[PDB]
């Protein structure tokens, strides 16, 4: 069967042949309780202490239990279950090439990464998950240490020179939808530049930026509170047009115009934004080691090995023991071995032939410490570090939780209509909520004046 | 796109890597989550204690 | 009166997310229940449901 | 194809060098 199957594709041999031949069999969860399942065919049948000696079936491979997001995790059994679950949940938030035909799609909130490299160590399961063709991260030379102090409580230090060269530099799209319709007998919408004379309702923004058709042309500079579509509804006309959300500052990629099912002019516009990786952006590896970049140093300031190899990320050593993520260290070691050799390695969860000692022995055959530690130098003074730092390649991801999309402020912004209080939501330019727990804390502090100010003066004064 | 070669898919502004199996309503990808429930036509004998019955033969 | 969340928007942020969403389940039990027996990973979920992939919030 | 032949040669080599396997970081269950 193995020979006939290995020559598939070429002739016509497939899984249906195995099923019909009587080698495999579908056992459902209700029947699995009455069969003596076996893990591996060779190990659990040779001849030893008589355990059962009545196996009826045998699994294909133990690691097949994992799902989608868990399969891409290298060495999951070498890590504690909560961190595996955290990685599985964070994997879905990793950016990258989410679909090859992204330039044709007009979805809302699409992220794409420039140089999505492939993991240096790939499990045998992701070969079918299609991860290698559409990865979501870049292999960075990570050195677990506490260089300066900006990477102590779950934070990292990225290399400014690396970012300049395009390290984890991705893009941010934002599509829009807007079409004209017949509101009423006298009311009617139409695309037209709202001039300064006929249109009564109008915004205090620039309008000549777009062409006469009323649609901003592609590749034009835009910023927050800028008109993107020239819609004007006749009452003379009211500027019932949308504007770019505050704090976006992008560039228009392409403009599409068509007719909807009703037959009215329907158009879509998407604005791109080159998000340079800056401090505050959330990153994460394939083991649950989340974090946000604290500070970025140039190459001259970052440490370096015996040769010109400066670390690209520096996580906190203290995050390893409490979280028990030895899988991350194993991944780093195997990535170093693979890079020295020059071919992708195997990180299958259960393989019975991937331990630490053999990997270490392999790594010792290239002029590097068998445990992966290396001697660095202080990037400032140039003195060797007493402790031999642990530096090596490792596959890291980037989440969409940008700092620019979360930063918000307010200074007597718009007010609601029902209760004259600030709005809610970053997009609507609203204020934060002073929850009851904050009130209780302020009462505990006894700061009655501050409490009354927050609740009356800067909330909703009225006589 | 039933059993269509990758050539046409690429020519139709689509990719052969898309898993598919998702509806398109009003230009939005809708997916039906697989809901789970209790198997029908099977007898269950529970032992609810916070009630007047010692055993209950639900079916 | 009917259920909610049966048809969700397919999260097209990365291929892994699309794969996970297209093969996702959802139990009809009420959200944020005091009980803790249905949430716990049961022994029968061997090879059928991933024992690691799951949210970490109230669900 | 080269990866397939590489895997096959690695497997046959692993089968050949069956002299001794004394390693510290590995274990397996043995019930009863």
């Amino acid at each position: 069967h193995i020979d006939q199957l290995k020559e598939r594709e070429y002739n016509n041999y497939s899984w249906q042949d195995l099923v019909a031949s009587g080698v495999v069999e579908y056992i459902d969860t209700l029947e699995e309780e009455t069969v003596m399942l076996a893990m591996t065919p060779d190990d659990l049948q040779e001849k030893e202490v008589a355990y059962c000696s009545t196996y009826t079936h045998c699994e294909i491979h133990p690691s097949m239990i994992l799902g989608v997001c868990a399969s891409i995790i290298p060495f999951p059994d070498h890590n504690q279950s909560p961190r595996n679950t955290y990685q599985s949940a964070m994997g879905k938030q990793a950016m990258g090439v989410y679909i090859t035909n992204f330039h044709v799609r007009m979805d809302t909130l699409a992220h794409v990464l420039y140089y999505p490299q492939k993991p240096l160590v790939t499990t045998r399961s992701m070969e079918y998950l299609r991860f290698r063709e559409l990865p979501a991260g870049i292999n960075s030379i990570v050195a677990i240490a506490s260089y300066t102090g900006y990477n102590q409580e779950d934070s990292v230090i990225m290399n400014r020179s690396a970012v300049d060269r395009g390290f984890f530099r991705s893009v941010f799209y934002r599509s829009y939808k807007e079409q004209e319709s017949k509101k009423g007998f006298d009311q009617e919408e139409v695309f037209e530049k709202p001039t300064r004379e006929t249109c009564q309702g109008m915004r205090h923004a620039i309008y000549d930026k777009l062409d006469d058709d009323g649609l901003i042309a592609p590749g034009v500079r835009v910023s927050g509170d800028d008109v993107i579509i020239g819609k004007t509804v006749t009452l003379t006309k009211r500027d019932c047009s949308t504007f770019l959300r505050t704090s976006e500052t992008g560039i228009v990629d392409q403009v599409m115009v068509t007719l909807n099912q009703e037959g009215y002019k329907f158009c879509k516009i998407r604005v791109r934004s080159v998000r340079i990786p800056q401090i505050g952006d959330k990153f994460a590896s394939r083991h649950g080691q989340k974090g946000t970049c604290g500070i970025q140093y140039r190459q001259e300031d970052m440490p370096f090995t015996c040769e010109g190899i400066t670390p690209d990320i520096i996580i906190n050593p203290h995050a390893i023991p409490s979280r028990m993520t030895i899988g991350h260290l194993i991944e780093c070691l195997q990535g170093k071995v693979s890079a020295n050799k020059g071919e992708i390695g195997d990180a299958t969860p259960f393989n019975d032939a991937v331990n630490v000692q053999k990997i270490s022995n392999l790594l010792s055959d290239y002029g590097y410490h068998l445990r992966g530690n290396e001697v660095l130098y202080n990037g400032f003074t140039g003195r060797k570090i007493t402790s031999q730092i642990f530096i090596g390649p490792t596959y890291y991801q980037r989440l969409k939780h940008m700092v620019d999309d979360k930063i918000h402020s307010r200074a007597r912004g718009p007010i609601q209509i029902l209760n004259r209080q600030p709005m809610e939501g970053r997009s609507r330019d609203g204020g934060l909520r002073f929850g009851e727990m904050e009130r209780d804390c302020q009462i505990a502090h006894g700061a009655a004046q501050f409490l009354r100010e927050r609740l009356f003066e800067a909330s909703d004064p009225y006589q | 796109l039933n059993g269509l070669t990758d050539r046409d898919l690429c020519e139709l502004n689509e990719c052969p890597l898309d898993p598919g199996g998702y509806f398109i309503i009003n230009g939005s990808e809708k997916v039906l989550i697989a809901q789970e429930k209790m198997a029908t036509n099977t007898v269950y004998v529970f032992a609810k204690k916070d009630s007047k019955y010692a055993y209950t033969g639900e079916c | 009166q009917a259920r909610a969340g049966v048809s969700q928007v397919l999260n097209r942020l990365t291929f892994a997310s699309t794969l996970s969403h297209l093969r996702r389940l959802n139990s009809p039990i009420g959200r944020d229940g005091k009980l803790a027996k249905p949430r716990q990973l049961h022994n029968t979920l061997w090879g059928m449901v991933c024992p690691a992939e799951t949210p970490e919030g109230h669900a | 194809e080269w990866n397939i032949v590489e895997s096959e040669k690695a497997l046959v080599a692993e089968s050949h060098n069956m002299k001794n396997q004394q390693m510290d970081p590995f274990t397996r269950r043995q019930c009863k």
Binding site: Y13, W15, T40, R124 | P19 | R23 | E8, S15
Partner: peptide, 28 residues
Amino acid sequence: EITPDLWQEACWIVISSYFDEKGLVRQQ
């Protein structure tokens, strides 16, 4: 003939065939 020892490689050929014949979202 049975496949002793040399089974790590033949263990994944079946998986490759299964995923080639049936897709990931084949159930839907």
